[PDB]
Design a protein around this ligand. Sequence first.
Ligand SMILES: Cc1cc2nc3c(=O)[nH]c(=O)nc-3n(C[C@H](O)[C@H](O)[C@H](O)COP(=O)(O)OP(=O)(O)OC[C@H]3O[C@@H](n4cnc5c(N)ncnc54)[C@H](O)[C@@H]3O)c2cc1C
Ligand SMILES: Cc1cc2nc3c(=O)[nH]c(=O)nc-3n(C[C@H](O)[C@H](O)[C@H](O)COP(=O)(O)OP(=O)(O)OC[C@H]3O[C@@H](n4cnc5c(N)ncnc54)[C@H](O)[C@@H]3O)c2cc1C
Ligand code: SF4
Ligand code: SF4
Ligand code: SF4
Ligand code: SF4
Ligand code: SF4
Ligand code: SF4
Ligand code: SF4
Ligand code: SF4
Ligand SMILES: [K+]
Ligand SMILES: [K+]
Lengths: 370, 370, 525, 174, 174
Amino acid sequence: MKFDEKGSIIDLETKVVYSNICCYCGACGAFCTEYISYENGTPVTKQKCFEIHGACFDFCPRTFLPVLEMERELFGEVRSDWELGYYTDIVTARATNPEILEKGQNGGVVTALLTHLIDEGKIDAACITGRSDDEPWKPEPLVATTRDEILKGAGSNYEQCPAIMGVGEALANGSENIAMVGLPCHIQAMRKIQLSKAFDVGASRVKYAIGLLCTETFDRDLLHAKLREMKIKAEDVKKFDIGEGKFKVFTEEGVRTEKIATMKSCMRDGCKVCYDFAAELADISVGSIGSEEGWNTVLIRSKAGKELIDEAEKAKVIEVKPLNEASIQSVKDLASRKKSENMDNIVEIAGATKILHLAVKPQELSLLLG
Amino acid sequence: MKFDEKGSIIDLETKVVYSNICCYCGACGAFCTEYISYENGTPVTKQKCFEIHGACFDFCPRTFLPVLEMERELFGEVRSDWELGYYTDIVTARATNPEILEKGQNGGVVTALLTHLIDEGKIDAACITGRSDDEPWKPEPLVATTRDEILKGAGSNYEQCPAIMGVGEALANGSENIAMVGLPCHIQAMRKIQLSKAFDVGASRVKYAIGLLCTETFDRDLLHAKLREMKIKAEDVKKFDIGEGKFKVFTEEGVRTEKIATMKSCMRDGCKVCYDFAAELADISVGSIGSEEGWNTVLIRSKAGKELIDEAEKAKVIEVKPLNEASIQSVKDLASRKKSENMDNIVEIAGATKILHLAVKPQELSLLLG
Amino acid sequence: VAGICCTAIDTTRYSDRAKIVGSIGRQLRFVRSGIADVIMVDEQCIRADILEQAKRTHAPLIATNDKALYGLVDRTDDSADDIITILVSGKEPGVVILDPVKAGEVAVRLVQIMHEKRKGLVHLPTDEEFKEYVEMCQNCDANCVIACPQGLPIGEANKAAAAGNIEPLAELFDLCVGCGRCEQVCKKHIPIVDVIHKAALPLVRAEKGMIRVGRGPVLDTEIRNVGAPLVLGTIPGIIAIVGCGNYPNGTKDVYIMAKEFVERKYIVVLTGCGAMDAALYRDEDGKTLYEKYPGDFDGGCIVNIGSCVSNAHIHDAAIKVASIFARRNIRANYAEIADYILNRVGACGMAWGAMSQKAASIASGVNRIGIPVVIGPHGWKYRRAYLGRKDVDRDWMVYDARDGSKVRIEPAPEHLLVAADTLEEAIPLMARLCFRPTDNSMGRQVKLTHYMDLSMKYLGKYPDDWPVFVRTEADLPLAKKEEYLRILKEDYGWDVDLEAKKIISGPIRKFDVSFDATNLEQLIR
Amino acid sequence: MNIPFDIGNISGPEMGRIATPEALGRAIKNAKRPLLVVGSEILEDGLIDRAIAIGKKGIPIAATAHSIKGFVDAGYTDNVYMVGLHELANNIKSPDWMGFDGKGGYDLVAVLGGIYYSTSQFLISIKNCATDPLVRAISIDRYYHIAARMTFDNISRKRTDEFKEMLDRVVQSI
Amino acid sequence: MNIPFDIGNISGPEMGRIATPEALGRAIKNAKRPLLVVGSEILEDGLIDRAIAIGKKGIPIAATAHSIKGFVDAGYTDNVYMVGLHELANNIKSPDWMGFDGKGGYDLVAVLGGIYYSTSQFLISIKNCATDPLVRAISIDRYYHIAARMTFDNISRKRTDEFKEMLDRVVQSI
Ligand SMILES: Cc1cc2nc3c(=O)[nH]c(=O)nc-3n(C[C@H](O)[C@H](O)[C@H](O)COP(=O)(O)OP(=O)(O)OC[C@H]3O[C@@H](n4cnc5c(N)ncnc54)[C@H](O)[C@@H]3O)c2cc1C
Ligand SMILES: Cc1cc2nc3c(=O)[nH]c(=O)nc-3n(C[C@H](O)[C@H](O)[C@H](O)COP(=O)(O)OP(=O)(O)OC[C@H]3O[C@@H](n4cnc5c(N)ncnc54)[C@H](O)[C@@H]3O)c2cc1C
Ligand code: SF4
Ligand code: SF4
Ligand code: SF4
Ligand code: SF4
Ligand code: SF4
Ligand code: SF4
Ligand code: SF4
Ligand code: SF4
Ligand SMILES: [K+]
Ligand SMILES: [K+]
């Protein structure tokens, strides 16, 4: 891709790991099982490697991310909307199958689309996220090969999953048609992998990148400390949700809530420099804001994304209806608040910005250009 | 200074000379007489030099120019006005001495202030620009040590002068107090020299940097080819001026004019990427726009600049008056024009703009930032 | 019993029953093949990791020279029985035996035992393993290719094989020089060297050539037969293809040089890895050069002088030409003989794959006695060369020993040690470097016919300055003499009478059969 | 990260600077007597069309290796001279050498389509021996020539289309 | 342009990366068993205060050369060990060496206030021989340590004020 940079593990450690901007996407580990492992959500190596340039640096979304150049390759066009990125349509939708609809986080659109793809042989693997049986609610990559395994991944986990680890697993297991689900950072990594001219890991076999809207993921220790403060054991939690200005924790005895602003202290450091709310680079991006309870907001972006929603609607696995202008605006508002606040974080770590001979602090950019 | 970079002749050639953004300020040659000469207004060397890092690269205004950082070091503040830079006061003014007012370009302010500084013993040399008596209207650096020599350099020359050559001559001739006159690019190079922590060339002896407003300089061959189209021999031109959207050529027989737009074709390539209209880094910046005929627009920037005008006015060598908001906006408008048009040229040459991990074409910064 | 590098040449010189595996470039691949039940090494050009490589294939290593012990126990004083027991039992992967008689007994007794114990082993990737390797390769933009001295397209070759086309990989086997650097920068841990071998297994197994054994010295009768035609030039020169196998583009290049020059009746002699590599190829009639041409030191013959130490026989042949054919004294008379060889003995060395320190000292000793040497593009890595400036008149002045006058001579040879990039540049250069100031009209005509034809064949155009080698019309190749005379007149501005077919002006010097060229003032009479 | 084609070719402290195609082209344009040096790799990927386009701007070409055959085959041999890379280096560093037209030396040498490790040593020779008068040696090839004054970064052979876009930009900037 | 204190110290292709003070600090913070290595130059410019501030964060100090005298005179000798730079290098790369407390080796080594050419070779020993387990060696000193994994660029002695500003930011980040 354009604006690509060569680098090795030392560059990754210098610019990402030790800069405190790793987002635990899992890409560097997914394609260097030979050396990289994860400790506390950041990659490490325990023995010297000898590659001149590595996929760890190339695939990382925090080393170099030329978003607009990537948009041109994926969509043929750059964005016209700064808050939401490039899209051809925004709708609201929900699954029609009652079991998917009851197990899904909101309307179960994601689970319904993946089930449609596997039922019609469009994919032979869905790289999603599941939950550990030993460590409660700890997300882990799930390489689903059955419609029942796809359903087992339904629901939001607000802790970060190294989901790309699942994509690397499916590409190494012989799957020929893969769909993956990812937060915006997962999507960025998947797109860096698919568009790389430095490495070929067979990512053309990934046919669908379904994005989730995301404001932030929570550090496990902080989140579970918060759960203990709410007097809730993680093993007793049936479902998490974020809505109505509230963090919702569902148990058999009922729902326990907490004002969402108090959850900010639980956010992962890596999420502080995230400049992408709506999964801008995905084929479709699925969320909750703007939609009614039990429904999903769905941004259509790529041609493959559009054909997927049309073919799913024809197959009657999802129900689709237009979204109101005031609803779309509520999506833009949340995107703007995330991007504006995190760009404030970005400019405190970023080096000087250079435009030909001119050099200024990124935060003072408008004093130079107006 | 902050955001300083190390470099050698090779980096200067890679990034400035062969990038076609050398502006012929004269700084690289002024402090490397050992190797650098000038051909067609660009530096060359004819023998290999062996410095690990060079003053040629350190002093050049087109290798690295951290304008806002240099503003804080020279003024204690950054700009709030992106069009005119940092200034404490904008006023119109002219000289009181008939001889200076007549020989001066507009109101003779620069010549008056310089003659004042030398008559009060506050400088012993004025690094300005003279004229070749062999090559008509060919600008040459003039180290003036007498109020006569200062008057000799009065008037505007629209051909580029390697003025910093004269600064280097003065800093090596024993002058203990130097004042320098320069277009914005000369001032930039002057300030780079004074703020440098990589080389010491006695630049603290330069006590005044008098900036001139500038839209562009003209290539000699193209300019004089226009003089032939207009049936005017440079040997007979008595004065040049630019006003009423006109390029004026004064001879005894009178004045021949031309649309200033038809003259854009004569501009120097190096001026195309110039982003500084009002000499933003000078102690004071003196121009014609905004003032009436025979008067000068003066922007006060540094404490030394403010002191120079106050003391000069208190000595009746100049007459100062306020300027209306419309007249100030006239100055602002031309600045915006030069900066808007020349940023378009900058972003054609510049590499990607990087903000932490995000990388974009410079002209697409808005699509990414909003 | 078969060898790699010069021990293989010297051993076949002792026994025509032994065989030669091949040159340095083939060493790692053959060892990795695991065909060898026991490996006995001595000194020089041995893979420094040979203990590792032997261990991997379960072949005991016998080290016989103190230049290379590899941390092994010195068992020179132990019984051959006890050494075999130790090696067979596996408690030591090799031994040092500095007594050659004992080393030989151990090796022979041990190889019979290990041959049985090593049956059933597999050393190269299987079909499935090969498939997993090429499929797991990430086609890295700049890893293995950057570490490879030849910049071979391993990644692209792997992906082609993953897509069902192994030809790209197979092509790399001969281009590869068996160094192993590629594998060390591959995070996937692909045994690249063995993957190329597997892809080329069919061609590797079909690598069956035929080479004449190292003959050693040139016979006195041969000096008397070729002396005059060599000095006069009607034998167009000695072409000595020697040196290591760090070639830029495989082992066939040296074969093509030997073939081209023997067909043109040069005396073609070979040594070391060059002699080996030229023997791997067969012409349309299925014959190796050593099978098709005689081994006499004569024009149109192919001669394996022998191992790298046998190179000295090439020097010796040129000295004997000065002593036997020119009746010069050689006793402690180096300068006079070297000056004789530089001015009268048309010859040129070629070390297309020059690599070692021994190759640099060989070239130095050959250069000092007056013989030019061309090397391959890797030869720039020696840092120093010896190059002439054909445009500087004062650099090409020689004395006519008849009267002490000074004569400017054509650049012959133009260079002393020079590196060429491609076979197609190198072959015309070699011919060019055989010109000598004492060539007679017939001899220059022979040499110029080949230089012009070879330049047209390989470069598609005659050299820009070929007229420098024309002193008279008799020097001109016969078949195109009239066209050359016109070219001399109309393209080079010479004064030539096309009607009389005679050159009037233009040549660098007048032809004089009695011109006694020398660089040595002391030879002026 | 600049990757020399041979990772061990770290010769010393003065390492070739990465230059835009436009800057490399302007260096050829600003030169009083430039020389395009091409090697055996010009005979591939339609690279000789670019060499010929450069030559037709009035620039002599040193056709090293056996590259002359492609010019003869292409029908462009005017102001193209057959020469060895080795002797060419020795001649360029020799201030008394009057060049291929006999009018003088070359102030700028640009390499294209050359075998990496020999071309690199050809560049190192000029860098270290052609110092007075200074001869500037640049690379417009697909390799990162650490021994050149200015050069492109490494462009893999599977990305040759990218190299050709950059080279074409060099030609347009001369 | 990264300038090694000895311009000739171009060891090979794997060259130390310029890192921010915060990144160097965090690498010490993330280490399981970091070790600060100081040499004879720590005895100048109040640099030992910075070393003691680091030690007081729970980090052992290897006082090479005669720097132990400065720690004795300063009143901080706890978790500070007298050792030669040469033997220290041999020890760190020895996977069986159990450190100064006998609990194991060190996974992160940071050099500060050291004679350039000997500390550089100390770093190159670790880079080339402490490979399994990998030991990461960094520089928070005033030199561009091309043999370090991560390092600052060269800060001349007449700019020691700026160096101290960055070194203090390292301490703040641990
Ligand atoms: C951490 C997080 C934060 C979110 N923040 C917002 C927000 O601010 N605003 C908003 O509108 N929507 C947000 N969402 C999206 C929302 O919670 C729903 O996941 C989305 O609307 C899809 O609903 P659904 O019913 O179609 O999902 P389902 O049909 O239940 O499918 C959910 C899919 O997401 C995958 N998944 C779950 N957790 C993760 C994870 N941590 N990483 C990767 N994949 C995962 C599952 O494996 C499954 O494939 C967030 C989601 C997550 C995981
Ligand atoms: C090339 C050029 C372009 C300009 N463009 C604008 C413009 O677009 N808008 C505007 O408002 N004003 C512009 N000016 C400034 C204006 O022309 C007057 O020079 C300025 O107002 C000062 O007038 P003065 O009567 O006080 O100067 P004077 O008292 O006559 O003194 C002029 C001083 O400028 C110096 N000088 C003259 N030519 C040059 C040169 N080429 N390089 C360096 N120093 C030089 C002289 O040596 C002298 O010291 C430009 C000046 C120049 C030289
Ligand atoms: S082997 Fe390559 S991908 Fe893995 S950590 Fe090292 S540089 Fe990164
Ligand atoms: S952001 Fe992802 S690819 Fe980058 S270092 Fe972190 S886990 Fe690895
Ligand atoms: S805020 Fe960004 S980095 Fe964090 S989990 Fe969401 S998409 Fe990833
Ligand atoms: S000697 Fe120094 S200042 Fe002069 S041209 Fe060379 S690097 Fe530049
Ligand atoms: S802009 Fe000034 S300092 Fe820079 S190269 Fe040109 S003349 Fe030299
Ligand atoms: S337009 Fe800019 S670069 Fe040109 S003369 Fe004016 S200040 Fe200098
Ligand atoms: S073993 Fe062969 S393919 Fe590998 S680096 Fe050496 S020459 Fe290249
Ligand atoms: S280094 Fe390994 S994975 Fe990369 S291209 Fe070479 S063989 Fe393939
Ligand atoms: K290579
Ligand atoms: K030093």
